[PDB]
C-alpha cells in the first residue's frame, strides 16, 4: 500500500466517524469528538469524490444540526479543518461554525 504517516493517521478519523455514525443511528445525541469526526470524515470523503473546496465549505455546514448533538457542542466547534488529496493535489478545507 505504501502508507505514509498522514495516511495512517487519517484512517483513525474515518474509524471515529464510523463509530459516531453508529451511535447516531441508535438515537444518541452526539458529543464533541463524535461531531468533529463525522464532519472531518465527510470532508475527506468529499475530496476523494472529486468535489471542489468551495462545495465542501458549503456542504460542511449541513452535515449535522444542533438537534443531532448535545447541548453546548455547536458552540464548542468554531471551525473544522481537514486536508485531503483532491484531483488537483492536497488542499485545506475549513468549515466555519459547521453546526447551527
Amino acid at each position: 500500500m505504501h502508507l505514509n504517516p498522514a495516511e495512517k493517521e487519517k484512517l483513525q478519523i474515518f474509524l471515529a466517524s464510523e463509530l459516531a455514525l453508529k451511535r447516531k443511528a441508535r438515537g444518541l445525541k452526539l458529543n464533541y469528538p463524535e461531531a468533529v469526526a463525522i464532519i472531518t470524515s465527510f470532508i475527506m470523503e468529499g475530496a476523494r469524490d472529486g468535489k471542489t473546496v468551495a462545495m465542501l465549505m458549503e456542504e460542511g455546514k449541513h452535515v449535522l444540526t444542533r438537534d443531532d448533538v448535545m447541548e453546548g457542542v455547536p458552540e464548542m466547534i468554531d471551525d473544522i479543518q481537514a486536508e485531503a488529496t483532491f484531483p488537483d493535489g492536497t488542499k485545506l478545507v475549513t468549515v466555519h461554525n459547521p453546526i447551527s
Binding site: 498522514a6 458529543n31 469528538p33 468533529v36 469526526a37 479543518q81 481537514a82 486536508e83 485545506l92
Partner: protein, 564 residues
C-alpha cells in the same frame, strides 16, 4: 478611545471583574486583578506589538533582563490568586509574573520581563494557565501511563514500581538499592518529573535507610508489606533523619492494631495518609478519621471522586480482582457513608490533596478531572461557599486547585521547585482552553519548553487540521528530555554523588523541609477537627455534626468530551 468589554475579552482574554465558566461545570472564576497597562498589552503576529523597536526591545542581550519565553495575557488560576498577567520564563524557571514588553516605549513593564531578540512567545490570551499537577500516588506499572498523565495536565509523578510486578501493582514501592538505581536510570527516558518511594518496611534502620541513600525521595508504608507498629516506627525514624516524606496505606485488617494503634506508632510525627477515605485501603472502617489530625497530610485517590450512582457497584466488582468472610471484608471496606462524607470533607478543606493511585486503584489521567467534578458537585449540593463574593466561585476554585498543585508539593518536600505559578519556581505550566479546562490540556510546558500538545495533522499546511490529538513535542526528544524534567532525590543520595554514579543527566531536585510541616501548612485546606466514624453504622461526624451526602446520576467533564 474605549473598547467594550466583550471585544476586549475576545482579543486579550478577560480582565478585572470578568468571569469564565470552567468547562461545562457551573463553576465561574473571576479575574481578581490585572497587571497590564490598558493599550500596551503584549501580543505577537503580523503588525502586532512584539516587533523590534516596538514591544520587542532591539538593544539588550539575553543577560540584560531579557526573557527566553513570554506567555502573553494569561488568566492564572493558582492558590496565590486568580488574575491576569504575562508570565516570563528564563533558564527554565518562572522569573517574572507581571507585564512584559519594551521599557523603551511602554509603561508598567516589569523590569526583568523584557521581550528581546532572545524571546520566544506563547499567546495565552483566552487561556487559563495553572501549575502542572503533582500526583503523589503513582504506581509505575506501564510506561504508557505517562502520556495519560500529561494529557490531563500532570507534570510530576511521585510513587514507586518496577513495572507490572505484583509488588508494584499493589504498592507505590521501588524496593531496595538495586531496584531504585534501575528505575532512576529508566526515569532518564520518561518526559515528566519523577520521585521514587522505597519500601517503608523493616525492623532495623539500615535496610530502610539504604534505600534513601541509593536515591529514593521518600518511603511508602503499605499493609501488603506489613503495615505493623515496627515498620511504621522505623520508617518515620528514617524519614526524620533523612528529611523525606512517608506515605501510609494502613492495616485495613486491623491485624496488629486499630487506627489508634497506628496513630500511637506514628507518635505525632509527620505522615502523608494516602486514600484517606479508605476504599483504596486502611483501617476498616474508620481510617478517614486520620484527616482530623494536625500531623497528618491527608490525600484522596481518584475513583471515589466524586460520589456517583455507579461508584459503589464499580468498587464492589473492582474488589473481586482480589477475591462469607470475603463479603464481610468487602462490606467493611466499600462504604457509601465514608465516600459520601469524603465529598464534603474536600469542600470543607479537611482533606488537603488529590492523587490518582494510577493502575493500582485509580486513573492516571483523572486527578485533575475529578477534582473539578467534585467542586462542581459540592456547589450544586451545598451552594456557593460562605466565603464567596460577586457570584464567583474563586474561593472554592483556589481550595480545589490547591489539592493537586501546591499541597502535594508541600507534602513531598518539593514546593521550592514545583506546585505553583510563582517567581523562582520551575516553569511547569499547563495552558487550557476554558471549554476543555480540567479535561484535555492544550499545551503542557516542562522546564520552559512544550513537552505535550493537542495538535493536528503533521503533514498539513498549518497545525490545526484533523486529527487533533495529544502528542509529545520537542521537549521530550533527544537530550532535551534531560533539561526539561527533574528527578527528585534525598539529600543524602545527592551528597553521596548518586547522579554521577548512575550517569543521570536529568535536572536533580532536592527533597527537603517535610518533617517540620503539618495540616496547617496545607494551602486553603488546613482544617483540623475531631472526625468520628460510628463503628456500627459508619455514620461520619465532624465535631458532633453528622455529614451525609448523596450520589449524582450525571457529571460535567464526561460524555460531552470523551470518545469512549
Amino acid at each position: 478611545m474605549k473598547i467594550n468589554r466583550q471585544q476586549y475579552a475576545e482579543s486579550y482574554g478577560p480582565t478585572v471583574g470578568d468571569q469564565v465558566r470552567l468547562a461545562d461545570t457551573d463553576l465561574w472564576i473571576e479575574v481578581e486583578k490585572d497587571y497590564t497597562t490598558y493599550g500596551d498589552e503584549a501580543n505577537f503576529g503580523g503588525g502586532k506589538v512584539l516587533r523590534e523597536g516596538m514591544g520587542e526591545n532591539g538593544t539588550y542581550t539575553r543577560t540584560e533582563n531579557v526573557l527566553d519565553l513570554l506567555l502573553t495575557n494569561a488568566l492564572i488560576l493558582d492558590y496565590t490568586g486568580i488574575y491576569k498577567a504575562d508570565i516570563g520564563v528564563k533558564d527554565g524557571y518562572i522569573v517574572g509574573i507581571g507585564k512584559g514588553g519594551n521599557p523603551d516605549i511602554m509603561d508598567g513593564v516589569t523590569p526583568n520581563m523584557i521581550v528581546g531578540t532572545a524571546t520566544e512567545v506563547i499567546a495565552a490570551e483566552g487561556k487559563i494557565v495553572t501549575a502542572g499537577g503533582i500526583d503523589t500516588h503513582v504506581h509505575f506499572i506501564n510506561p504508557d501511563q505517562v502520556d495519560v498523565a500529561l494529557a490531563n495536565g500532570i507534570t510530576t509523578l511521585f510513587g514507586g514500581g518496577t513495572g507490572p510486578a505484583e509488588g508494584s501493582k499493589a504498592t507505590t514501592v521501588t524496593p531496595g538499592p538495586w531496584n531504585i538505581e534501575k528505575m532512576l536510570k529508566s526515569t532518564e527516558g520518561l518526559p515528566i518529573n519523577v520521585g521514587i518511594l522505597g519500601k517503608g518496611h523493616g525492623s532495623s534502620i539500615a535496610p530502610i535507610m539504604e534505600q534513601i541513600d541509593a536515591g529514593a525521595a521518600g518511603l511508602k508504608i503499605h499493609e501488603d508489606w506489613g503495615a505493623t507498629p515496627a515498620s511504621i516506627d522505623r520508617s518515620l525514624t528514617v524519614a526524620d533523619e533523612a528529611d523525606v516524606q512517608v506515605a501510609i496505606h494502613s492495616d485495613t485488617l486491623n491485624e496488629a492494631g486499630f487506627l489508634e494503634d497506628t496513630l500511637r506508632a506514628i507518635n505525632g510525627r509527620v505522615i502523608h495518609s494516602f486514600h484517606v477515605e479508605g476504599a483504596g485501603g486502611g483501617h476498616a472502617p474508620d481510617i478517614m478519621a486520620m484527616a482530623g489530625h494536625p500531623n497528618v497530610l491527608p490525600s484522596s485517590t481518584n475513583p471515589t471522586r466524586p460520589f456517583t450512582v455507579n461508584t459503589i457497584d464499580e468498587h464492589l466488582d473492582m474488589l473481586m480482582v482480589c477475591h462469607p468472610e470475603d463479603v464481610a471484608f468487602a462490606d467493611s471496606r466499600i462504604r457509601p457513608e465514608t465516600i459520601a462524607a469524603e465529598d464534603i470533607l474536600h469542600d470543607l478543606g479537611i482533606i488537603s490533596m488529590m492523587s490518582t493511585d494510577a493502575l493500582a486503584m485509580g486513573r492516571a489521567g483523572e486527578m485533575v478531572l475529578r477534582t473539578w467534578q467534585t467542586a462542581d458537585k459540592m456547589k450544586k449540593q451545598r451552594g456557593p461557599l460562605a466565603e464567596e463574593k460577586n457570584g464567583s466561585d474563586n474561593f472554592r476554585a483556589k481550595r480545589y486547585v490547591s489539592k493537586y498543585t501546591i499541597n502535594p508539593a508541600i507534602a513531598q518536600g518539593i514546593a521550592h521547585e514545583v506546585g505553583s505559578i510563582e517567581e523562582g519556581k520551575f516553569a511547569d505550566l499547563v495552558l487550557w482552553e476554558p471549554k476543555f479546562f480540567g479535561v484535555k490540556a492544550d499545551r503542557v510546558i516542562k522546564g520552559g519548553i512544550i513537552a505535550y500538545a493537542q495538535i493536528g495533522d503533521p503533514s498539513a499546511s498549518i497545525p490545526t487540521p484533523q486529527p487533533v490529538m495529544g502528542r509529545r513535542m520537542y521537549g521530550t526528544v533527544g537530550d532535551l528530555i534531560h533539561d526539561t524534567n527533574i528527578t527528585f532525590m534525598s539529600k543524602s543520595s545527592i551528597q553521596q554523588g548518586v547522579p554521577a554514579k548512575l550517569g543521570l543527566k536529568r535536572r536533580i531536585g532536592t527533597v527537603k523541609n517535610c518533617r517540620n510541616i503539618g495540616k496547617k501548612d496545607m494551602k486553603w485546606n488546613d482544617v483540623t477537627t475531631d472526625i468520628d466514624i460510628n463503628p456500627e453504622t459508619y455514620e461520619v461526624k465532624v465535631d458532633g455534626e453528622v455529614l451525609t451526602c448523596e450520589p449524582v446520576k450525571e457529571l460535567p467533564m464526561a460524555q460531552r468530551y470523551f470518545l469512549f
